Structures are given as C-alpha cells and as structure tokens.
Amino acid sequence: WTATSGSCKGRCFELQEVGPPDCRCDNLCKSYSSCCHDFDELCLKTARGWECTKDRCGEVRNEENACHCSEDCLSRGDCCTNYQVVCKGESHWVDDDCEEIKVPECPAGFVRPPLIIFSVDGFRASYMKKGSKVMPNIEKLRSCGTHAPYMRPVYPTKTFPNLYTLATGLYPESHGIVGNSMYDPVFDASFHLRGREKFNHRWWGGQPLWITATKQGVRAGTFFWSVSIPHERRILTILQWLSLPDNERPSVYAFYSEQPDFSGHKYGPFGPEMTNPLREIDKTVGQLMDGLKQLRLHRCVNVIFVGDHGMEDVTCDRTEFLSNYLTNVDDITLVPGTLGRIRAKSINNSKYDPKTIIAALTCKKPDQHFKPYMKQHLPKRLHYANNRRIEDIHLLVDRRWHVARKPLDVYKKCFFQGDHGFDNKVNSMQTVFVGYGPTFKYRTKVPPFENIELYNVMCDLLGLKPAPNNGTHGSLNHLLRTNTFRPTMPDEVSRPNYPGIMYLQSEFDLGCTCDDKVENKLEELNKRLHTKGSTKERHLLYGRPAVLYRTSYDILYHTDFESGYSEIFLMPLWTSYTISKQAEVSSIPEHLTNCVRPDVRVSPGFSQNCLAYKNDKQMSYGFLFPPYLSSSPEAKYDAFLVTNMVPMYPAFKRVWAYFQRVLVKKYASERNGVNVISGPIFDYNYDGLRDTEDEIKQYVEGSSIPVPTHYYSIITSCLDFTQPADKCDGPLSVSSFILPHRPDNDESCNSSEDESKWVEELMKMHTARVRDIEHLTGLDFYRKTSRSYSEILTLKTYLHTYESE
Ligand SMILES: *[C@@H]1O[C@H](CO)[C@@H](O[C@@H]2O[C@H](CO)[C@@H](O[C@@H]3O[C@H](CO[C@H]4O[C@H](CO)[C@@H](O)[C@H](O[C@H]5O[C@H](CO)[C@@H](O)[C@H](O)[C@@H]5O[C@H]5O[C@H](CO)[C@@H](O)[C@H](O)[C@@H]5O)[C@@H]4O)[C@@H](O)[C@H](O[C@H]4O[C@H](CO)[C@@H](O)[C@H](O)[C@@H]4O[C@H]4O[C@H](CO)[C@@H](O)[C@H](O)[C@@H]4O)[C@@H]3O)[C@H](O)[C@H]2NC(C)=O)[C@H](O)[C@H]1NC(C)=O
Ligand SMILES: CCOC(=O)c1cc(-c2cccc(Br)c2)[nH]n1
Ligand SMILES: [Br-]
Ligand SMILES: [Ca+2]
Ligand SMILES: [Cl-]
Ligand SMILES: [K+]
Ligand code: NA
Ligand SMILES: [Zn+2]
C-alpha cells in the first residue's frame, strides 16, 4: 500500500528515497508503482522538445517546458543541452579539438572530480570500430581518453550478473546474482527479471560502489532509472544534480541505457536495424558532454563508458532439446537458453540421479551443441560453483545455440535473432571500456582486462577504500594519470628448510625399485654443487614463490629443476624448470620404466611409497619435472626421485604425458625458451581457495598421500621473443592452465583418438590467470624481477584466451 496522495512539488528526483505508505518522487518510484499523483506532470515534462531553436533564445521562462532557453537557465542549471550552441554561438563538444587534461579544471567548491558512469547494455566490443562512422562523440571519448580494445565480462554473460559485478568487484558466485533467473533452496524463493522478488535485499551480497561511497562520506546520486523515463530526462536530471550546492551535490552518478541490447535481441548483433540505436546512444553522449561543457564541467569530470556484455547471432532453429536425450524429461527443471542449469523437479523423488543424467547428456550426437558438467568440473577461470543458487548440473552451450527442455517451450513461449550469456572467453561476448577525464591518461591504449577490476579503480577515482573484492588492486594502475594505489608484496609466512643428505638408502621401506647401482673426482664436486643450488639461477628465473600460509616445507635443488616440497602433503607445492629453444627431448630408457628412487634428504616418514600405488587399483603416478627433458643421461636419475612423484589417474596420464613430451618443447621453439612452474591444486569444496589438509576427500588407498583435484602450469618467456627466456631484459609473456584431475576423459568427445587431436584443445579450455593459481595454492609468484610491481600485477591477471582476432 501507498497513500499516493502527497505531492512532488519541489521534490522532483529527490536524492534520499522516502518511506511507505508516503509517496515517492525518486527516479525509481515508477518501478514500485509508488509515485505521487503529480509525478508525471511536475517531473516528466516534455513540452516543446529537447533542444533549443533560434526563435526560443532569450524567451520568457515557461515552467512547463522540458528544458529552457531563457537567460536565467544557466544559473538555474536547467537549460537544454544545446542552449549555448544555438543561442550564444558556442560549438558542440565533439567539434572541439581535444586537449590534454593535465589537472582537474573544476568550479570553486568542488572537493574532488565527479565520476559519471555511462553504462550500455549489450554493447559488443567490435561496435567501436564497426560503428565508428555513426558514433562521433563516443569515438572522441575513445581516442582522446584511455581505451581497451575490449573488456572481458564475467560468466554467465547476462545483464544482472555483469552489472552487479561492475558495482562490487565480485564474481557472481560471491555477490549472489548468479543468473538473470534463480532459485534459492534455503530461502525457498525465486528471483525473476519480471516482478517483485528481485527487489528484496537478501539476494544482493557484497558491497556495491554507492554503499561504499555513502559509508565513507561521499554522496551518491541514485544510480537506477525506471525504464519509461526517457534518456533525455536522465541526462537533464544528472546535469541538474550537478548544479546543487556543494553540501548536497553527489560526487558519483550513473546513467544506464537499455540499448543496444534491446534491439540486438530482435535483429542480431549486426542487423542493419542496428545503426539507428548506435546513433541514438551517441546522440545521448553528445547531450551529456554539451551539458557538461555548458556548466564548465567538461575538463573536470571523469567519465567511464562501459558495457555489461556483447551480443551473438542466435535463432530458434539452433536449439537443442533435452527431450532428444532423456527419457525422464518431466522429472527435471531446466533453467534454459545460452546456459543450462538442471535440478530435480521434486525433492520428494529419490529415484532422481544426477550421474545418470550427466551420462545420458555425454557425447551422444556427432555435432552436439552443449556439454554437461558437474559444476565443480567447470573450468576454474569461470569461477562458477561456490553458491547454493548454482545447480550441481550445468550445461555450457556452444556460441550461436540454445538449450531448451521440450520443443513446446520454444513455440508456446521465430522471434529473436540475438542472445548472450555464453562462456566469457567468447569474442562476441566481449564488451567495451573507455575512461575519459583528468585522472585518466591521454590518448592511451591499454590491454584487455576483466570487469571485476573496475570497482577498485572507481574507488581510486573517488578517494575510497574498496570493500574486500576479487579484483587485484594495482593491476589497472596503468590506466591512470594519478590516484594510483601503490601496493606491497604480501609477506612470506613460512620460510623453507634446506635439507642436506641425512638418510641412508636402507632406511627406506617404500616398496620402490630402480635399476640404478652403476658407479670420479671431476664429476662428484659437480653433482654436489648441483644439489647445493649451482644452476638455480637457470631454473628459478623470478625468485622462489612465497608461501603465504603456515606450513612445513623444503627447498630441493637439482641440475634440471628446483622444487618446494611439502612435508604435510608429501609432494611438491611447486616445481620450477627452464627449457631453452635448443633443448632436446629424449625417451625414458627401458631399465628405468618403473624406477622410483628414495630421496636421501627427506625422511621415509615424509615420503610417498610405491606399495600404496600398487594397492590402489584406480590410481597411478606421474612426475612434475618431466623425465623426457633431462639435460643428460646422468641428470635423468633426479627425475625419478620419489619427491618428484604425484598421484595420477591413468586417464589423466594421457593428458600429462602429451603436455610434457610434446607441448613443452613446442612452446620452447615457438617462444625462444620457456620457464615452467608446475604443481598440484586441492579444491574439494570448489571455493577457488587452497584447501587445508582437513578438507581433502581422497587419498591414495591406504596411505596419507592426498589426491589433487587439479594440476597447474605457469609458462613464462620474454615478450620480445628475440631474447631467450633466461636472458630477458624487458616485459614478460605468460600463459597458464589449471587442468582438472579426472579418472576419465568424458569431457573430450574425441579422446579415443590420438592425443594430438584432443589434448591441446582441452588445455585451452582450462586456460587460467596466474592470479587464479595463487588463490588455489596460497603462493605468490614473480617475487624477484627487474619489473615494477604494478606491471607484475597486470601480468598475473592476464588470461590467454585462444580466440582468433
Ligand atoms: C572473491 O572475494 C570475496 C570477498 O573477499 C571472497 O569471499 C570471502 O571469503 C571469505 C573466506 O571464505 C569469507 O570469510 C568468512 O566470513 C564469514 C562471515 O560471513 C559474512 O560476512 C561478510 C562480510 O559482511 C559477508 O559479505 C558474507 O556474505 C555472504 O553470505 C550471504 C549468504 O548467506 C550473501 O548475501 C553474500 O552474497 C555472501 O555469500 C557468499 O559468501 C559465503 C561465504 O561467507 C558463501 O558461503 C556463499 O556461497 C557466497 O558465495 C557473510 O554474511 C565467517 O563466518 C567465516 O568464518 C568461518 O570459517 C573460518 C575459517 O577461517 C573459521 O574460523 C570459523 O570457525 C567460521 O566457521 C564457522 O561457520 C562454519 C559454517 O557454518 C562452520 O563450518 C564452523 O564450524 C564455524 O561455526 C569466514 O571468515 C567472506 O565471507 C567472503 N565474502 C564474500 C562477500 O563472499 C572470495 O573468497 C573471493 N574469491 C576468490 C576466488 O578469491
Ligand atoms: C537494471 C537497470 O540498471 C540501471 O538503471 C543502472 C545500473 C547502474 C550501474 C550498473 C553497474 C555498475 C554501476 Br557502479 C552502476 N546504474 N544504473
Ligand atoms: Br546493478
Ligand atoms: Ca578450497
Ligand atoms: Cl540465467
Ligand atoms: K595403481
Ligand atoms: Na572421451
Ligand atoms: Zn539482453
């Protein structure tokens, strides 16, 4: 109930919203059906249009007009945006040459540059180039300010998840808006795009920018606009708030456009009907900049032009139907479309089984256009699992396609030519970023970055301390002229032991064998210096990684590689080695096929044993430094040390072996040498964080050898590939992966073929940022380089995507 009977006289677009059943005059009142009787009349004036004309200049103030061309309008702060152009002979902002804004040029009383966030639904990244002729205003922002060629959205590439990620710096799994459509089993409630429940505060986790602003004493202009409020009125409102007294005026503002998403859905991303929406958006930007220029605020305000997601070609005929796969289709609930989410229709049916459903959806048709997953098996880079709102069963749908339950759903709902929501690595999903203003750099291109990073920068722009978030603060320092945030490396928590030879061979009762008892002064000081760390500078190029938690581990040196070996997990946390362009692949000799050797620096009690592997019918083992890349027959022995051994399912060994035998050398050729750091990851509770030992659900049968959920690799070289990895002068180049450690290869439909037809594609699917690996391991890499820390932070957030240009 609202007693809609009060008035909006002198209250139009009030900054503090008021409490029921009193009536409202704020820019959101329409969405709650709660405006005062006179809101339309007083607040949504339209009379006479949105522009001055020659004959309107110097007119009598008629309070009924939408905007004004009378003499007093400037001091009142309510002229039409073109007033000075038409009536005082001024030029439009877009027709002015651009000039570096070295310092805020603000009116007296402004304590900081204001920030205006101009967000646009469905603005595909390629529109910047492809629509550049019809967007002169946006194009001046882009080329004069700072721009990325695209910005990576979060998965799923839907509107609400992405807007709230922009607002909070959080993955959807942490902020709670995990789709446009949701069921919370704890609440027993549903969230929908249409309706009432989406307004309830309990859906919305983390701390959005406007709350962060308020708590720290920065005023925020009510971010959100009712859909029927035309765009011209939104701009005039923002411009009016900017004319308020110093004590009342907001410092941060938000404009949102429903275009071009709304049109893209009907016509496809490049429909010829798409030119007009792009022209209208540019006109809107033009109105804002002209209005800022009028108020002498155009060299004072920081403007962010930002998209939530792109748009892809999708039609009705490109639908897959679960009814073509499942006999039991009526006992399941599907969240449909560009992603699939499956749960039981009734919790009272115990004959439901996720295992049988996954199996029936696995590699069933030659060209199948989705892939099912248990959510914990999704690529770690999606960060899409740790929320009770995300169903155990997920479908990743191919770009250009849809998934529905039964065909009736599609035709008892062809309408659409465009949709979004697919995997966030997909080109057509990429969106935009432009920063323009005194705090941004001038005429600067920056590399692609992820939208999770913006919350930090918008806090920086405003002098705020960000709430705890998933950005890496400092990683976007290169976009900014000043207000940079200068972070420090986290302190190492655990120091390593450096064990020498302390144990005799006979003390080890591991059930391991090796054909190795084959017998010199020149070459004995030699292997000792190797064990003391004489080639460490060759294999540990960026310093040893820091261990950021409390644990007990040893550093182990060898001719070919260096490891940090965990006495708690009985395996290395990390193994580091360098492979030069010139290096040669050999084979594992026959005498050494099943050779595992005791490590006389590590106690039997801190070692794995061979017997456990023999007893465990499911689990085999592999090596972190690959025997294949030994620098000599004599050095090859080090690769068979029990302290280089990790638990591996036979099916994963196929993956691991091909990566190690074929791909490492390939990358050394292509990149002029590589540095490699490999290791295990444990994430049994799929939270994206390093598991403590009490979190491990699986051990190699009858032992305390814990089983990894994933294996990572970080592959580094010189960005200038004319210089070899070990002798690099400048910036670095990185790619990494986090491969799930699976007992089968069900994920790769062509895995009964030769490894050269499926392994590399699998690795690409599971590409990762070094930062992802850090969360999952509690290590901090790149500790000792010649590069600035901000630059290293950027490198750590890089994701190698494997999409073409
Ligand atoms: C991305 O960035 C984010 C932000 O930094 C990272 O997430 C943080 O991770 C922390 C570690 O997991 C976590 O810290 C915990 O805080 C608990 C108190 O939690 C509240 O406080 C914050 C601050 O106000 C608040 O934001 C939280 O809001 C969550 O919950 C509601 C839903 O109930 C949502 O509205 C909201 O969206 C958000 O949900 C998300 O987070 C929770 C995790 O808290 C998930 O479960 C959800 O799925 C969802 O993703 C909270 O209201 C505190 O209780 C924890 O302490 C427990 O564990 C420690 C170990 O140190 C132990 O000392 C204690 O004993 C304690 O355990 C007790 O409870 C257990 C369970 O009942 C029980 O097993 C024990 O026996 C004990 O009795 C913990 O310190 C922090 O909350 C989140 N913050 C957010 C916003 O998510 C995230 O890690 C980053 N991601 C990556 C990949 O890096
Ligand atoms: C759903 C309609 O959305 C709106 O009206 C709107 C959204 C934002 C916004 C979005 C993301 C980050 C920030 Br910070 C602000 N501002 N206005
Ligand atoms: Br939002
Ligand atoms: Ca974990
Ligand atoms: Cl959804
Ligand atoms: K075995
Ligand atoms: Na297979
Ligand atoms: Zn949309």
UniProtKB/Swiss-Prot annotation:
Residues engaged in binding Zn(2+) 1: 121, 159, 308-309
Residue numbers spanned by region Nuclease-like domain: 541-805
List of catalytic residues: 159
Glycosylation: residue positions: 3, 348, 360, 470, 750
Cofactor: Zn(2+); Ca(2+)
PROSITE patterns noted in UniProt: SMB_1, SMB_2
Residues annotated as binding 1-(9Z-octadecenoyl)-sn-glycero-3-phosphate: 159, 180, 261, 420
PANTHER family per record: ECTONUCLEOTIDE PYROPHOSPHATASE/PHOSPHODIESTERASE, ECTONUCLEOTIDE PYROPHOSPHATASE_PHOSPHODIESTERASE FAMILY MEMBER 2
Free-text domain note: The nuclease-like domain is most probably catalytically inactive as residues that are essential for catalysis in the DNA/RNA non-specific endonucleases are not conserved. However, it is required for the stability of the protein and the catalytic activity born by the Phosphodiesterase domain.
The protein, known as: Autotaxin
